[PDB]
Amino acid sequence: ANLDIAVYWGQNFDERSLEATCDTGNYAYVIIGFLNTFGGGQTPALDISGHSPSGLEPQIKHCQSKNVKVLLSIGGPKGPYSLDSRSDANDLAVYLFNNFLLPPGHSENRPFGNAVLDGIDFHIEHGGPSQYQLLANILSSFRLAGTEFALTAAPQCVYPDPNLGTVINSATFDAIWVQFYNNPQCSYSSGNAEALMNAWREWSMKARTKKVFLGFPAHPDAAGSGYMPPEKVKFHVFPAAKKSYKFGGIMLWDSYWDTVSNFSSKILGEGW
Template sequence: MAIKSAISFAFISSVILVLVLGTDVGDIAIYWGQSGNEGTLPESCATGNYGFVNLAFLPTFGNGQTPMINLAGHCDPYSNGCTNLSSDIKSCQAKGIKVMLSIGGGAGGYYLSSSHDARQVATYLWNNFLGGKSVSRPFGNAVLDGIDFVIEGGTNQHWDDLARYLSGYGKRGGTKVYLTAAPQCPFPDAWVGGALKTGLFDYVWVQFYNNPTCQYTAGDIGNLENAWKQWTTYVPATKIFLGLPASPKAAGSGFIPVADLTSQVLPAIKDSSKYEGIMLWSRYYDEQSGYSSAIKNYV
């Protein structure tokens, strides 16, 4: 009897835990590709911590430039060496993880000179990374789930056009093209604020770091909470993520200790119907800190 009671109690406790955690657990999005020391893509996906992996970056495109990816020490795109990632990408997708191509980034020569230029870039992205066809696909025959806009330079023009063209390709090709973006937390974002107004973006992971006016500081959630309300109220995206550095070394400011995130920040923002989870920069820092493992049951 005592053993049966113990087993029953354990079973009930497990069910309660699943109900508490499993029904309201969000996703974690991670950036991978900017450090050769962050492990392989399959290793990252095998952790079970991530719902999205953003391959960073395609930093050269637009205005007639030949587009070129840069995945640090992971592969050499100039020798077509990144096609080896095809099976890695598929293995992640087989686990239910959406794999995105991040365009832009903090360095690189990218901008769109016109609506026509935006259309040409969209055509390139569709044929080389998404559901189209090309003889020179950088990741081979792997079909990525969508495009992540990390626009931090160039100009703020024609990103809305690019979003419309990409969305249109997805509809005509019968393959959903997810559109995501990583704007800075000062609202509205100086670079992609206009594009986000299109309502075409599925997920927006806002960078709540390196911006003291709208990020968390020790014991003070006010700035972050106010900015969060602006983003979730005025941006017509399907879902919003809280973007954070995965360790104190990952950004100049804005890191939130696990205890503060779980006890103060998440309880203040998770009531929003737009809330979907956490974005982390980056896999390299997350692997070092174990941040995603520490927070995943609270997200």
């Protein structure tokens, strides 16, 4: 199917390591979550379930050496993050750029050491659009100032998204993974994919991005609702989705669960 799979990593202290996740060969993107603290007088902080940030340095490089794109996700499902001021946007943009998207300038420091990430993922779950458009604008400007990195977003499945809808409308994102879960109005539920398919139709039609990925839970325990078994996704979801020029593949939540479920292995025919 040539399927590209994006996966979130960093949700569990005890999860399969970052390097081992990349070694699976199942993913085109691994999204480290999350920078879940910023804004509102706060200094930015990571919540990567107790994993050592510095410890990630070599793992990230290993991932990239095997051609897996490694992104940092800002926000997340939960967390004391906000971005209501223009200053907040400027601060976070410069912070992300200096620290994660450029080689060391040898002065301050960097959470992931001297590793250079392949992009930033907007997983904004609350607060409304606030100043996220400005953040994207500044990061996008950097994208044009010599640092070739990607900008992605993870909106919930109701179109348009209340938090990222406007930013998405700017066409600034290289790719978007819609969370087709935790919302019965637009995800699989009751052995019925109508709501899911209608939502996919609208997203593939209206989202101003080159690639739209369908995000699914990798296990029934991974989300409150919306889990769809892999065989059902292949049978039911792919034929229609593949007819879209914007179909990018799927996103899974998350590595910890995927390791248990073998969802990606099943979707791919076992892609070791």
